[PDB]
Design a protein around this nucleic acid. Structure first.
Ligand SMILES: [Zn+2]
Ligand SMILES: [Zn+2]
Lengths: 365, 163, 365, 163
DNA sequence: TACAAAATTCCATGACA
DNA sequence: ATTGTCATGGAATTTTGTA
DNA sequence: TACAAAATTCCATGACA
DNA sequence: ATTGTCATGGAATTTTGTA
């Protein structure tokens, strides 16, 4: 209807004059530098874009190149982009091409026993009937307790931490959302003692980074001791524990033990610098050491990062994606931005989820 | 010669036998000479073995320079003697019959037995589960001298469970 | 013996005067800014370094900080480094902190059928009794043949390529060292037809990158078609094949099909630009297109890269490392440097291995 | 109107029945109108079905604009008619009894039958395994006109197996 | 007020999930 | 509802013994 | 000979093993 | 004996219709 005026040589907003618009086969055509292209009517154009796209569900540029073979019209891409935004399938399947903003470096806990980080290593080769190691790191000091267990079970976690909290009781225990810690039995054990439980966003081990990093060293040392020998790790845990708690961090220039106690015990190469201070002078020299510790800052953002705005459309990564099925969930709205790397989304559909942006992508278009 | 410090000396003793809880009969008692911090380990016998198994737990945290004890058969044994020579711990023994500790340790070691008795009565079969609650209470207990809990002297901060 | 002269106040190369060297407990001691440290005799020093190191097998700085508690002597680190170089255990267990130099971008094959890249996808969910897809990409064009199979077996690879080479015969078939292609039955099948077999270095899929990348797209499209539906992928392969061979690479601005045939078949949105040229004009316009294609260059080297020198000590990554065992093999000599990213090593011990530097680390020290 | 091109027209025919090889009896023959390139597919019957199953293989590579055939029951069927309407292929039929191809196709389609016979004799039971070797030979065979192998006209380069 | 070498700090790289 | 970490060993930088 | 917007190119990001 | 690749969609850059 609107293409009537055109053939006559009357101007229409978006249709560049200087190209002659003619008629053949009862289709409107145009001579363009690229060649001679059919101009479809308005109503036909959505149908066309969709057909072109659906051949192999291609992106902007790929989808256009197909269409531009036969057709021309004003602002072609605008129309293509409109479809790619409404393609249920491309949305939930295509990967991201935007990386999450720079990570946060949460302030080191102030006092020992302010925060514990906990995790299970394993399963390992059966040693003496044990398969897993419970690992507990004090946030402030990096002091570490190891307990061999037969299962990553609440039951065994409780047994192990009962022995631990005979020394002292933490304010906060931070763990991943693994079944062993998200149980209601654990919450109670914790409530009784006045310990606050705190959980990482789901599927983001970086949040448990202090334990996870310590997991590495535990394993790497066990490995070194076990070379040649069969993997008898049960008897080794204590030695490892002790060895690790008494090792210097070249950055801090202190061992976890030192940060925890303020003097070396009777271990090899025990430091004697504070041998003349009364316990009291020593204990305040310690408070001085503990607050002066090196604290890392956040790194520069990469060229093509994104950050979460409230009300943004956003998609959560499918956790355990089955073979040949989409790697992403359907779109979700951002509800609150708890910090530049953590977000509350209205999900599927709909509960509140608290998630790391590393498991997020911005719905494109 | 130089001022007294944590891990300089560990005073150890056996308490028992007690009414059986969870198949245990004895409590090994380790108090730190300087701070008064207390570790408690339930054992099944006052044997060298039970002591070593228990002290292996403690020495994953810290090793004392000296362990002081009475001339109990368990500590006078040469197995225990060899154990301590390995970890480089000097063994030190009180005279037979005249068992001396620190002024502060005697005070502390007395507190334990009385605290144990007060909480044994009523639940004599169930003292095992309580050892942590006990251990915690002792270490966060105000000392007439210094007015510092053992906890405070060991860690140099305040605890999250005061008494 | 050599520490006699010192106490008397006679100079020794490496022992800074201005600090007074005295005697206690029949050990030589020195007053230093840091404090008062024992100077052990020459013969005792290796013994010491080793003990310090062996506590938890620590690196340079960590190992020194232990030692420096009690002792001092000239060029302490030199001695530490000497040990870390001879620690069998640290060598084969510690990770690298040097990244491999920038990747190579091998020139695109000149003609179609010059080189085929081949790989198996799977296993997948059983569809019609089939579990794997054999994937064959022409290096030059990126044209792709798909064949469903029940096993990644030589047997089935041969069946499938017999149908393929009815069209034409390649010069070179490039594959990974997977059992299906490294069999002697395959070598013969290939020899008969005058096809040269060519293999990626072991455990380096980047070398089969053309297929591997195409594996991705095959899977991503199958996924998109299968949303909602059960995973009936058997019937889809043809459509996928066709859909993919006829999709534009926004960089090339051509479809694989176009590069292979030089005109579009009777598919949707088929390009008509060369409708007036004789087949002959067209066929030379094609030769022009094929040589003008965009070719990527190698990226800048990262700050802390390394490159292989002949005679360098070098270690190959343990392929399928068992739980708790070293992630690296014992040291190996570089024999020839086939190119900046590929190396011949004298191995374990000793055969010639050809390996990618991505599976290599420089033995440190 | 415009110069003849690959994929403009596909000439198809059935050869058979032949002595059974690998349980097959027939060869479907597809020659490209313009280049003379030849595809061969072994079938078990000259049925619509066998044709469709076979042509599904070919049309994963390229789809012709037109298929030309004789009025064989297999190609005149409405199943086959629907198959081709779907892929947007125009069907074109020669007169009954007067079966016309291209000058070049007649030449080529004759070559095939003679080549098939020469290599059938001696191994009549084993012609299946040879279809690739046959197909290859035809497509890399020099044409008196153009002096271009079908291969060359289709791909615009030279093959690695000349004859 | 200045040098070569040692001692110390910097920091990219990779592995823990 | 919460959040990455840090041993390691060449290289870069600063300090040191002596003048 | 210069403008705003469209059309095109650039290119980091991530997934295939 | 051999070797990374390339769709994707915001951003950066270049071209275009009109003056
Ligand atoms: Zn789509
Ligand atoms: Zn070592």
């Amino acid at each position: 209807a609107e293409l009537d005026q055109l053939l006559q040589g009357h101007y229409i907003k978006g249709y560049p004059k200087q190209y002659t618009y003619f008629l053949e086969d009862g289709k409107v055509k145009v001579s363009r530098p690229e060649g001679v292209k059919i101009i479809p009517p308005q109503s036909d154009r959505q149908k066309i874009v969709l057909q072109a796209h659906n051949l192999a569900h291609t992106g902007r540029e790929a989808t256009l190149l197909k269409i531009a073979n036969l057709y021309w019209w004003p602002n072609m891409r605008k129309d293509v982009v409109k479809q790619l935004g409404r393609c249920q399938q491309c949305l939930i399947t295509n990967a991201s091409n935007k990386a999450s903003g720079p990570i946060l470096r949460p302030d080191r806990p102030q006092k020992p026993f302010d925060k514990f980080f906990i995790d299970y290593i394993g399963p390992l080769p059966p040693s003496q009937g044990y398969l897993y190691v419970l690992v507990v790191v004090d946030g402030m000091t990096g002091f570490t307790w190891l307990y061999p267990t037969k299962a990553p079970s609440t039951s065994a976690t409780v047994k192990s931490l009962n022995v631990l909290t005979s020394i002292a009781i933490p304010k906060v225990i931070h763990s991943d959302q693994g079944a062993a810690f998200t149980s209601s039995t654990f919450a109670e054990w914790a409530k009784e003692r006045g310990i606050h439980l705190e959980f990482s966003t789901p599927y983001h081990p970086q949040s448990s980074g202090k334990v996870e990093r310590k997991n590495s060293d535990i394993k790497r040392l066990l490995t070194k001791l076990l070379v040649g020998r069969p993997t008898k790790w049960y008897d080794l845990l204590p030695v490892v524990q002790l060895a690790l708690n008494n090792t210097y961090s070249p950055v801090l220039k202190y061992t976890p033990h030192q940060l925890l106690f303020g003097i070396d015990s009777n271990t090899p190469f025990a430091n004697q610098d504070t041998l003349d201070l009364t316990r009291e002078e020593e204990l305040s020299l310690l408070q001085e050491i503990r607050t002066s510790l090196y604290h890392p800052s956040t790194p520069p953002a990469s060229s093509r990062s994104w950050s979460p705005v409230v009300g943004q459309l956003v998609q959560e990564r499918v956790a355990r994606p089955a073979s040949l099925r989409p790697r992403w969930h359907k779109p979700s709205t951002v509800l609150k931005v708890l910090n530049p790397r953590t977000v509350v989304i209205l999900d599927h559909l709909g509960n509140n989820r608290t998630v790391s942006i590393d498991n997020l992508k911005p719905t494109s278009h | 010669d130089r001022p007294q410090k944590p891990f300089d000396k560990f005073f150890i003793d056996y308490i028992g036998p007690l009414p059986p809880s969870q198949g245990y009969l004895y409590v090994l008692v380790v108090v730190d000479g300087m701070t008064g911090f207390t570790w408690l380990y339930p054992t099944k016998a006052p044997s060298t073995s039970a002591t070593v198994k228990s002290l292996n737990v403690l020495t994953s945290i810290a090793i004392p320079k000296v362990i002081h004890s009475d001339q109990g058969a368990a500590f006078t044994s040469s197995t225990f003697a060899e154990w301590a020579k390995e970890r480089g711990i000097h063994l030190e023994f009180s005279t037979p019959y005249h068992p001396q500790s620190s002024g502060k340790v005697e005070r502390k070691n007395s507190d334990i037995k009385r605290l144990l008795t007060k909480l044994l009565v009523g639940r004599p079969t169930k003292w095992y589960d309580l050892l942590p609650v006990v251990q915690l209470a002792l270490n966060n207990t105000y000392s007439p001298v210094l007015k510092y809990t053992p906890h405070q002297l060991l860690f140099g901060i305040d605890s999250n469970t005061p008494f």
